[PDB]
Design a protein around this motif. Sequence first.
Motif, PDB file in Angstrom:
ATOM      1  N   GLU A  27       0.836  -1.190   0.000  1.00  0.00           N
ATOM      2  CA  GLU A  27       0.000   0.000   0.000  1.00  0.00           C
ATOM      3  C   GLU A  27       0.876   1.247   0.000  1.00  0.00           C
ATOM      4  O   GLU A  27       0.520   2.267  -0.590  1.00  0.00           O
ATOM      5  CB  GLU A  27      -0.908   0.004   1.231  1.00  0.00           C
ATOM      6  CG  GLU A  27      -2.033  -1.014   1.039  1.00  0.00           C
ATOM      7  CD  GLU A  27      -2.767  -1.233   2.358  1.00  0.00           C
ATOM      8  OE1 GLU A  27      -2.217  -0.876   3.387  1.00  0.00           O
ATOM      9  OE2 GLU A  27      -3.870  -1.755   2.318  1.00  0.00           O
ATOM     10  N   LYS A  28       2.029   1.153   0.660  1.00  0.00           N
ATOM     11  CA  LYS A  28       2.949   2.282   0.721  1.00  0.00           C
ATOM     12  C   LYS A  28       3.533   2.558  -0.659  1.00  0.00           C
ATOM     13  O   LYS A  28       3.708   3.712  -1.046  1.00  0.00           O
ATOM     14  CB  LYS A  28       4.079   2.004   1.714  1.00  0.00           C
ATOM     15  CG  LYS A  28       4.910   3.270   1.913  1.00  0.00           C
ATOM     16  CD  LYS A  28       5.923   3.037   3.037  1.00  0.00           C
ATOM     17  CE  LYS A  28       6.679   4.336   3.324  1.00  0.00           C
ATOM     18  NZ  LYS A  28       6.384   5.328   2.251  1.00  0.00           N
ATOM     19  N   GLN A  30       2.241   2.120  -3.738  1.00  0.00           N
ATOM     20  CA  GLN A  30       1.290   2.897  -4.524  1.00  0.00           C
ATOM     21  C   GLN A  30       1.212   4.313  -3.969  1.00  0.00           C
ATOM     22  O   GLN A  30       1.143   5.289  -4.714  1.00  0.00           O
ATOM     23  CB  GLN A  30      -0.094   2.245  -4.477  1.00  0.00           C
ATOM     24  CG  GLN A  30      -1.004   2.905  -5.515  1.00  0.00           C
ATOM     25  CD  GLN A  30      -2.408   2.313  -5.430  1.00  0.00           C
ATOM     26  OE1 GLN A  30      -3.052   2.389  -4.385  1.00  0.00           O
ATOM     27  NE2 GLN A  30      -2.921   1.725  -6.475  1.00  0.00           N
ATOM     28  N   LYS A  31       1.237   4.404  -2.644  1.00  0.00           N
ATOM     29  CA  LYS A  31       1.180   5.696  -1.974  1.00  0.00           C
ATOM     30  C   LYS A  31       2.376   6.550  -2.388  1.00  0.00           C
ATOM     31  O   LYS A  31       2.271   7.771  -2.494  1.00  0.00           O
ATOM     32  CB  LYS A  31       1.180   5.509  -0.454  1.00  0.00           C
ATOM     33  CG  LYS A  31       0.819   6.834   0.220  1.00  0.00           C
ATOM     34  CD  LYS A  31       0.795   6.647   1.737  1.00  0.00           C
ATOM     35  CE  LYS A  31       0.353   7.952   2.404  1.00  0.00           C
ATOM     36  NZ  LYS A  31       1.227   9.065   1.940  1.00  0.00           N
ATOM     37  N   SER A  32       3.510   5.894  -2.625  1.00  0.00           N
ATOM     38  CA  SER A  32       4.720   6.597  -3.034  1.00  0.00           C
ATOM     39  C   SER A  32       4.979   6.404  -4.528  1.00  0.00           C
ATOM     40  O   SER A  32       5.981   6.883  -5.058  1.00  0.00           O
ATOM     41  CB  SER A  32       5.919   6.086  -2.234  1.00  0.00           C
ATOM     42  OG  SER A  32       6.130   4.712  -2.530  1.00  0.00           O
TER      43      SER A  32
END
Length: 86
Positions: A27-28, A30-32
């Motif tokens: 999830e991180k 995609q977040k980044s």
Amino acid sequence: NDDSIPTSAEFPPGISPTENWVGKLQEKSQKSKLQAPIYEDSKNERTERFLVICTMCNQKTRGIRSKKKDAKNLAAWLMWKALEDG
């Protein structure tokens, strides 16, 4: 990285009942805006445990721990620490 890939054993500080790290990493990304990592589960009879290996764009970590979920929790939580690099 053919002499000893990043290896560190440690349980996150204050683990919740449904605390998901592996999901927190992907999830991180995609977040980044990064790629999706892959992992494999294996168990060494030497210490009789379960370990997961994490692989990213150009990095790889190793997590030796108890049960599978615990094994996966480390590998992801591992690269996570190596991702910050500061």
